[PDB]
Amino acid sequence: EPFWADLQPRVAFVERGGSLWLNCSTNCPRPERGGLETSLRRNGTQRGLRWLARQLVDIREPETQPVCFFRCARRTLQARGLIRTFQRPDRVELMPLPPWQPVGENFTLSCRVPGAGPRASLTLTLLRGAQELIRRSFAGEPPRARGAVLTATVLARREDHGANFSCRAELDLRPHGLGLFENSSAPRELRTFSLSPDAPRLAAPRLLEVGSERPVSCTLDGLFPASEARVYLALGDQNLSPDVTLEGDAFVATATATASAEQEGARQLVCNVTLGGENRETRENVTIYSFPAPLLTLSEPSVSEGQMVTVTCAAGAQALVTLEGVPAAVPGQPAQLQLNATENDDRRSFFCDATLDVDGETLIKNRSAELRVL
Ligand SMILES: *[C@@H]1O[C@H](CO)[C@@H](O[C@@H]2O[C@H](CO)[C@@H](O[C@@H]3O[C@H](CO)[C@@H](O)[C@H](O)[C@@H]3O)[C@H](O)[C@H]2NC(C)=O)[C@H](O)[C@H]1NC(C)=O
Ligand SMILES: *[C@@H]1O[C@H](CO)[C@@H](O[C@@H]2O[C@H](CO)[C@@H](O[C@@H]3O[C@H](CO)[C@@H](O)[C@H](O)[C@@H]3O)[C@H](O)[C@H]2NC(C)=O)[C@H](O)[C@H]1NC(C)=O
Ligand SMILES: *[C@@H]1O[C@H](CO)[C@@H](O[C@@H]2O[C@H](CO)[C@@H](O)[C@H](O)[C@H]2NC(C)=O)[C@H](O)[C@H]1NC(C)=O
Ligand SMILES: *[C@@H]1O[C@H](CO)[C@@H](O[C@@H]2O[C@H](CO)[C@@H](O)[C@H](O)[C@H]2NC(C)=O)[C@H](O)[C@H]1NC(C)=O
Ligand SMILES: *[C@@H]1O[C@H](CO)[C@@H](O[C@@H]2O[C@H](CO)[C@@H](O)[C@H](O)[C@H]2NC(C)=O)[C@H](O)[C@H]1NC(C)=O
Ligand SMILES: *[C@@H]1O[C@H](CO)[C@@H](O)[C@H](O)[C@H]1NC(C)=O
Ligand SMILES: *[C@@H]1O[C@H](CO)[C@@H](O)[C@H](O)[C@H]1NC(C)=O
Ligand SMILES: *[C@@H]1O[C@H](CO)[C@@H](O)[C@H](O)[C@H]1NC(C)=O
């Protein structure tokens, strides 16, 4: 039985910044020299015959090898040991995914667990809801190195809208006799959208008569989420309130649009829809007209018989006026038809036609009035 040196514990696993006791002993009856050699710290100490104890506090190093040495009978007697540290995955961070992610396009997922060690004992897993997307074990990494990073790129889908993404960090110390420490990051909700480059189809009449209700409709296709989409449809600068329903992935905006006049002779119909960070618009110009139908009025209601009269129309100097088939003569006016009253002319209808062209389209309206002859 020769002389020996013994320190306890031989190998010790202690949390980073923690503390532990080392008492180094020997069988030498009267050692001339003894002490503990390490790089870390001292808090308090307990010694005596054949053994000394040191309190190593605040351990900031991944791996250290404390050596306790003794001297008896002018010989060097030493003992070596091992102290390693770990760090819980207390801080786990997930990157701030884009506000709106296009459906059918890839996006990055990166879980970040800084400071956690040892790296080889870290198992990182990306989670969508309760489902595991990917599992990456870092086993085979240097024991000295800490921290872990897991990056994976997945495909944005339809269901991915309103779905939670997180990352689970597992530090497995179990084979070392300590245990398993796992902590999950903050779940992040994703919002996905798909907006077709196609322009919305707008159904509108070319001409709009004042005081008449002409229905208009603005629709599109392939919009998700459909309910999330906001739609504006109006007449010129005058706001409207379209009834909006949802047929499939398509929205249907339908309402009746009246005319005022107001202003002026022509305008545009504006329909635009903002979904997420993108928006589409279709503008169909529409000419607006007012039709002042000519008057059938007479110079005088009676006029017996034999006295001439002057008949007027007044389409408003726009349309070409024809009163009972006469191309008046002269234009820009309710131009006159001069007729001497006759008994045979009793109750004769005057046909007044007004031909007005707007935006290249011709419109006419007709009626008749009579005159009594005494
Ligand atoms: C989603 O992201 C992944 C990863 O960035 C990409 O998918 C990859 O797209 C490329 C382009 O077609 C391909 O990668 C490689 O293609 C060559 C042939 O050109 C082949 O020899 C390689 O083995 C590899 O497949 C491939 O389609 C695909 N690769 C994988 C592993 O998925 C792309 O950015 C996105 N995928 C889409 C949009 O489908
Ligand atoms: C996915 O994760 C998100 C958070 O990133 C979860 O949202 C959270 O849960 C619900 C919304 O579904 C909210 O519930 C709250 O309940 C309490 C008690 O009833 C009430 O006082 C609150 O006013 C609210 O209604 C909660 O606020 C919300 N948290 C945040 C920050 O928005 C979502 O639930 C997860 N998905 C699933 C399927 O669980
Ligand atoms: C470090 O080791 C020494 C080895 O001597 C321990 O001292 C012994 O303590 C036991 C207690 O069960 C006694 O029975 C022995 O008689 C002690 N040895 C001697 C030589 O007196 C010491 O206690 C250990 N340190 C700690 C903190 O336990
Ligand atoms: C390090 O020294 C501190 C004193 O600065 C020791 O603290 C004593 O013991 C416990 C543990 O912190 C405290 O609750 C007591 O109040 C402290 N005693 C006194 C008299 O102050 C501590 O034990 C030492 N060791 C470690 C590992 O911290
Ligand atoms: C949705 O419609 C509204 C109508 O009020 C648009 O508002 C104007 O649109 C023009 C052309 O896009 C802009 O130049 C003006 O600055 C807007 N002014 C106001 C007060 O909104 C709106 O722009 C349309 N949305 C999109 C994305 O075009
Ligand atoms: C889990 O990680 C979060 C990340 O911020 C941290 O705030 C929390 O203290 C951790 N919990 C435990 C028990 O480690
Ligand atoms: C509609 O009118 C606008 C002017 O307001 C004009 O720029 C545009 O070309 C017109 N549309 C067509 C198809 O001509
Ligand atoms: C006027 O005559 C045209 C052509 O005969 C006809 O289409 C139209 O209905 C008539 N107007 C009225 C109010 O009946």
Residue numbers in the entry: 1 to 374
Q: What does the original paper state about this entry?
A:
ICAM-5, initially called telencephalin, is an integral type I transmembrane glycoprotein of ∼150 kDa that is expressed exclusively in telencephalic neurons. It has nine immunoglobulin superfamily (IgSF) domains, with a total of 832 amino acids in the extracellular region, a single transmembrane segment and a 64-residue cytoplasmic domain. In addition to integrin recognition shared with the other ICAMs, ICAM-5 has unique characteristics within the subfamily, as it mediates homophilic adhesion interactions that promote neurite development. The crystal structure of the four most N-terminal glycosylated domains (D1–D4) of ICAM-5 was determined in three different space groups and the D1–D5 fragment was modelled.
Comparison of the three crystal forms indicated some flexibility at the interdomain interfaces, which is probably needed to facilitate cell–cell interactions. The largest movement between the most divergent R3 and P4322 structures (r.m.s.d. of 2.7 Å) was ∼16°. The overall P21 structure is nonetheless more similar to the R3 crystal structure (5°) than to the P4322 structure (11°), even though the tetragonal and monoclinic crystals were prepared under the same conditions. This could indicate that interdomain movement depends more on crystal contacts than on crystallization conditions.
